[PDB]
């Protein structure tokens, strides 16, 4: 029954709304310089960074940064806080995925471990446009050009994501689509270490079935979007890859940089 698949489609979209405070809808409303019910403060240079804390919730330093964790450090030390924020949110979303919690407790931890970052960059796309990304729950907007100018080892930490996002937003997907897509990325099954893969692939077929019907109904005139979407899962993989090696490089250049525990566990080698 296709009626059963729409139900699951609605269920996941519902938890999607409940677990992510900043949807793609809100993001675009904020990004398109029209709905000015509340516009973002822009960050495109150090001077703006200063003023940044002024009208934005920033527990970081406001004045000089050179002799006190420079802009680069400040920004990514904050970038960590959000990354964990995202994990916890996704972890919560994951629990609402039918069958997920019923899987082996180990397998839950393995699916989260490998999927939590592919989803982050997917959604991160919702907060981006060719020129920059939304920060502090849509309250701010940091320029891509600013981010690319950061210190030699931090400057190329985001660029590869902007590129991912520009072509991925082209698909023009929305939250109800993402909800199912994000639920397909978790219930994969080819993740390294999974014990019982069959019970997992049984859920993904279900989710995949849901995502398909969803895409057809929701984008009738968009030929093979389903396949075009699924192929994007590869683009994600690569990105996670370049990220970790970039992370492995920081760990050596900044002996004082502290990677948060939760993120340390998730990440491994090879």
Binding residue ranges for rosiglitazone: 80-83, 117, 243, 267
Binding mask 62-101 for its own copies (x = CB under 8 A): ----------------------------------------
Nearer to ligand YRG, 86 or 185 (CB): 86
Q: Count interface residues toward its own copies (CB under 8 A).
A: 18
Q: Which is nearer to its own copies, 95 or 216 (CB)?
A: 216
Residue of the chain from 167, 216, 251, 268 that contacts its own copies (CB under 8 A) = 167
Non-local CB neighbours of 126 within 8 Å, separated by 6+ positions: 22, 23, 24, 27, 28, 169, 175, 178
Q: Least Å distance between CB 190 and its own copies?
A: 7
Chain residues in the site for ligand YRG (CB under 6 A): 76, 79-80, 82-83, 86, 120, 157, 243, 247, 250, 257, 263
One-character DSSP codes across the chain: -HHHHHHHHHHHHHHHHHH-SS-HHHHHHHHSTT-TTSPPEEE-SHHHHHHHHHTS---S--S--TTSS-HHHHHHHHHHHHHHHHHHHHHHHHHTSTTGGGS-HHHHHHHHHHHHHHHHHHHHHHTEETTEEEETTTTEEEEHHHHHHS-TTTTTSSHHHHHHHHHHHTT---HHHHHHHHHHHHS-S-STT-S-HHHHHHHHHHHHHHHHHHHHHH-TTSTTHHHHHHHHHHHHHHHHHHHHHHHHHHHHH-TT----HHHHHH----
Q: Evaluate whether 122 touches 182 at the Cβ level (below 8 Å).
A: yes
| Shortest spacing between CB 163 and ligand YRG, in angstroms | 14
Window 229-248: residues binding its own copies (CB under 8 A): 230-231, 233-235, 237-238, 241
Report, in Å, the least distance between residue 82 CB and ligand YRG: 5
- Decide which of its own copies, ligand YRG, none touches 164; Cβ closer than 5 to 8 Å per partner kind: none
Q: Which does 247 bind (CB under 5 to 8 A by kind): ligand YRG, its own copies, none?
A: ligand YRG
Which of 217, 227, 249, 259 forms a contact with its own copies (CB under 8 A)?
Answer: 227
Least distance in angstroms from the C-beta of 76 to ligand YRG: 4
| Chain positions contacting its own copies, by CB under 8 A | 167, 190, 205, 208-209, 212, 223-224, 226-227, 230-231, 233-235, 237-238, 241
């Amino acid at each position: 029954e296709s009626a059963d698949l729409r139900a699951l489609a609605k269920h996941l979209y519902d938890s999607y709304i409940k677990s992510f405070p900043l949807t793609k809808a809100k993001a675009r409303a904020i990004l398109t310089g029209k709905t000015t019910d509340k516009s973002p403060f822009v960050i495109y240079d150090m001077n703006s960074l200063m003023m940044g804390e002024d009208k934005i919730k920033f527990k970081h330093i406001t004045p000089l940064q050179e002799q006190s964790k420079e802009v680069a450090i400040r920004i990514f030390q904050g970038c960590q806080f959000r990354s964990v924020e995202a994990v916890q949110e996704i972890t919560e979303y994951a629990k609402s995925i039918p069958g997920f919690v019923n899987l082996d407790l180990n397998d839950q931890v393995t699916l989260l471990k490998y999927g939590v970052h592919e989803i982050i960059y997917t959604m991160l796309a919702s907060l981006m446009n060719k020129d920059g990304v939304l920060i502090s729950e849509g309250q701010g907007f940091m320029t891509r050009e600013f981010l690319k100018s950061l210190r030699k080892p931090f400057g190329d930490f985001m660029e590869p994501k902007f590129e991912f996002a520009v072509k991925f937003n082209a698909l023009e997907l929305d939250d109800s689509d993402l909800a199912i897509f994000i639920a397909v990325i978790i219930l994969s099954g080819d993740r390294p270490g999974l014990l019982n893969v069959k019970p997992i692939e049984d859920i993904q077929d279900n989710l995949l079935q849901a995502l398909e019907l969803q895409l057809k109904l929701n984008h009738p005139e968009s030929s093979q979007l389903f396949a075009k979407l699924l192929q994007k899962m590869t683009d994600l993989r690569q990105i996670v890859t370049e990220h970790v090696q970039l992370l492995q490089v920081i760990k050596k250049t900044e002996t004082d940089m502290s990677l948060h525990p939760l993120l340390q566990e998730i990440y491994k080698d090879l």
